[PDB]
Amino acid sequence: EVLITGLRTRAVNVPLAYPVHTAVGTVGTAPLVLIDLATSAGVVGHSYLFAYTPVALKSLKQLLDDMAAMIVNEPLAPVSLEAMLAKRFSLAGYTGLIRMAAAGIDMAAWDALGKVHETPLVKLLGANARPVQAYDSHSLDGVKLATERAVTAAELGFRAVKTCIG
């Protein structure tokens, strides 16, 4: 009864507050695809995908745009949409980029469904909101920068940090 009426995507390369240092060098931006799922209820679901490397970014955006044809005019019923996408991609391989694109749809559909019911997603799933302990994630930073980032995270109130080693 609530139907999906549109899918818009936007590919962006966005600045990171913490540049990610790697064995190769430092990456300052993240490739994302921002998703807007329009509905017959007027509300729009929002989600996004992380493409990991700019090499995959346009391909992932293109895939989602082409997958729009499968979902526009279907009811906003994420579980049912997921089953349909799983079946449609059973030959191509329901994994990798295809699976990630299907997940972006699913996340936007549940955000829309929360909006249809004017309730936070956690409550729609049947649970109460509760605070959840968070760790601050850093990178392959070496001694100087790992110490600096760890001090900042502790000052912010985090009780754990993650560093990349190797």
Ligand X SMILES: O=C(O)C(O)(c1ccccc1)c1ccccc1
Q: Is residue 5 within the footprint of ligand X (CB under 6 A)?
A: no
104 vs 35: CA distance, rounded Å: 7
| Shortest separation between residue 49's beta carbon and ligand X, angstroms | 12
Q: Is residue 66 within the footprint of a second copy (CB under 8 A)?
A: no
What residue has token string 């605070």?
131
- Indicate the residue among 69 and 156 with the shorter CB distance to a second copy: 156
- Paired residues of 34 in beta bridges: 10, 48
Instruction: Enumerate residues 6+ apart whose C-beta is below 8 A from 26.
Output: 19, 20
- Residue from 54, 147, 159, 162 in contact with a second copy (CB under 8 A): 147
Q: If contact means CB under 5 to 8 A according to the sort of partner, which of ligand X, a second copy, none does residue 143 touch?
A: a second copy
- Indicate the residue among 70 and 164 with the shorter CB distance to ligand X: 164
Q: Is residue 151 within the footprint of a second copy (CB under 8 A)?
A: yes
- Indicate the residue among 34 and 164 with the shorter CB distance to ligand X: 164
Instruction: Enumerate residues 6+ apart whose C-beta is below 8 A from 140.
Output: 21, 22, 23, 163, 164, 165, 166
List interacting residues with a second copy (CB under 8 A).
143-144, 147-148, 151
